[PDB]
Symmetry: D2
Subunit: 257 residues, 4 copies
């Protein structure tokens, strides 16, 4: 019973931002659990390459181009997955950016709007498009990649738009959880600490940043993408049947202090 | 000494959305505490009427036209206040809208983006413009009107964009609190329950909505604008000297259950 | 109207732990707002000196001996105040201790139990005894001194029993808020950061502790007792009429990071 | 890789309150993941029955008498497991009681103190005794059974001591997470909604209670023990390697409204 609940055999999953980093780890975890996974990403090349690596390991993985700033792109990408796969059982929404080391008094409208558009408006576009399909199935699960930045404020790097966008993502996901609970849908978010990715490594290589991050973390380390993916895979599975609207802290204790 | 900490004599306060409802109650409380208050609102006629009423009560109140969806408008209005008054000591940010009874699957891009733009992007525009002056002064206080909707999901009315945008406001304010703490600035938010205003008439006059609201509230009532204004005035005052980044629940116990 | 809401003229307030530090600041603030205040404290000589000092300033104050580890003591002290003054309008519950720099693997039963008994069990004894009178009145307000330690875990000093006891206090107060809301009673807590007091001054003179506390605080300072007393006085007043079950953060931004 | 992270083969787990209901479900989940499990419970005959049933399925399960109000009992039971098994890898702390429908103004000292003693003091006793072994090992994981009652206040049933005790449990576990993170130990809690058990059956058959619980739940149902056990098993596993100090909501959306 209990180990079987963790399986995702034959379930169709779309992972936005799935071509690299946390997204790619989530793709890999879902695929290992038996899911049919579609990488939805802005980079057509990256996605196609990732698909090859994963098929190489025997995974049922495909790709579609998606731009989360563009409603038409998102809806076209979701429709074509629905077309080819017949169903969408799982959405993992990882698409996001972080514009950091930009003081609140300095940030431009363009920086503000871009940050909110990708992280928060993109979450709306993604979840709405997939949600409509899940509603007709009366079955589905969404996992969003939130951030501890939605709950606490990072130091010393300034990024108020990021922090606000992720708090928005958390409460948006909770709203969906409430609205869609009677219709067989669950929606949760993970809120990770710093994860070593191609992008955060620039922060990691700057001692003023990295030393503060480590000093502020009880476990004394950043996380790795597979550690976020394991939680995401769990939340996507029937093992998590009683969980909806949860902001799950995956942060090495950062928010405890 | 304790009672004198509550006074705001000669302090310059800008209240966005100050022409009616919670905004106007905040303007009144600030003025009664001794502040020189500027109503910053979209509706010039409504603002001018409010100014006339308050001036007849012996208060020092004026108004300025401000559209929080427009950066130029916000920057010009804030500069005008600074030029005419000499300082900006306090910002109370009330400007906001709520598009409700719109299901998450049905909400248009237009509805989502308008709510995020006024509630959240408007908060950035207003706090940055005022914040720059406060940073120069190495002194200032911001109070945002957040919402219990930033932490819990209202029922039965669907309003996922509102809920997300207000969670965004809370965490934005907290980011400003952290960034600006060393510079003599405090920033807090109030998170109220339902308040009787023109904007909640549609719910209060609809039994399916109102009865649910009351049943969900330990005090068994909605709040009045003056009850929010009292907390806002407190948070704007030196009595709240140790409070920054606080999301202050003003909700008749609604979030307790 | 707004400034009048802050007054407590002729209201009867009991302050447990009121003889020094945060308790005494709360006593002072309440007295300055017009309340008749009873210091309820274990140390008779200390309470008596405090009463005599405040009386010299024109305040209406008195004291009663109360041991919050002892139910008979608490009940007798509260009954005595009720008979002597005719009513109990306000309870501010400050009595507490902090056993710190004791690792979780080392803490004895005696150390654990004493901390829980004073901080949490003593909160139940105090609140029940006053609460019964407030229920008869259909009117009352409780303010507990909680702690940021109920929400986050202090560093580097170990004090898991204190942290647990204060989280217990916060949720106990919220429980009372919910149960007693229909009967004209409000109950809230403050959650302060480090406050300079006779007790914490030892930690403040220990760089390993003090430097960590300052480094973790956005305002870069500890608080002063009067800054907590201001928030407590506000929460005890009709100005806070819409607030019940609130855990009000008074922490110089400590919990924001 | 991802599926192997969920395995607990040959790891030693003690489950307090493990003979029935949630505890028994946790025992079963751990055993199905390959753990060596010891039921630690108040009554010997009840635990023995469970052992016999699980051994019939080929599981490696045993039991020990443990009374969590009694330090000697707890220390002796933990020592017995250590001497028989050579290590303790996992503690799931489920021992607890709920005295409910007792108004705050009515609750006796005996009722308050017993609830705090079993739920909170017993958590300290259990966690210290096991924690000492885990510190020697520089390896261990604790999962406490908290409650949504630590975060929100149940209705209509009055149970302030239970609510307080569980908030205490949450913050005690977070304190252990912070203190023991550098030493290879993780500590998290689950915060469930109503779970159908032999004890909650009586409430579920009282319409005044059950109808309110259902109406308060987005999923419109209570949970089953296996749904809590699945989350506990995940948290105990290396798949949860990045999670410590998390209060994980498993509440069918109850705390979202
Ligand atoms: Mg922190
Ligand atoms: Mg609720």
């Amino acid at each position: 019973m209990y180990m079987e609940k963790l399986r995702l055999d034959n379930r169709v999953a779309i992972v936005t931002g799935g071509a690299q980093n946390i997204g790619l780890a989530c793709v890999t975890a879902l695929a290992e659990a038996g899911a049919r996974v579609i990488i939805a990403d802005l980079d057509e090349a990256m996605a196609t390459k990732a698909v090859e690596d994963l098929r190489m390991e025997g995974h049922d993985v495909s790709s579609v181009v998606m731009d989360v700033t563009n409603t038409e792109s998102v809806q076209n990408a979701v429709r074509s997955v629905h077309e080819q796969e017949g169903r969408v059982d799982i959405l993992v929404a990882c698409a996001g950016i972080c514009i950091s080391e930009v003081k609140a008094e300095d940030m431009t409208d363009g920086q503000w709007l871009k940050q909110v558009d990708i992280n928060l408006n993109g979450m709306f576009r993604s979840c709405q498009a997939v949600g409509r399909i899940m509603l007709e199935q009366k079955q589905g699960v969404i996992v969003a990649i939130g951030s501890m930045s939605g709950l606490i404020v990072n130091r010393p790097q300034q990024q108020a738009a990021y922090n606000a966008s992720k708090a928005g993502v958390h409460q948006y996901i909770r709203s969906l959880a409430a609205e869609w609970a009677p219709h067989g849908i669950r929606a949760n978010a993970v809120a990770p600490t710093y994860i070593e990715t191609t992008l955060t490594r620039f922060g990691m290589e700057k001692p003023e940043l990295y030393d503060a991050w480590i000093a502020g973390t009880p476990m004394g380390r950043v996380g790795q993408p597979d550690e976020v993916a394991s939680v995401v895979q769990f939340l996507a599975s029937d093992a998590a049947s009683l969980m909806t609207g949860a902001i799950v802290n995956v942060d090495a204790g950062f928010t405890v202090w």
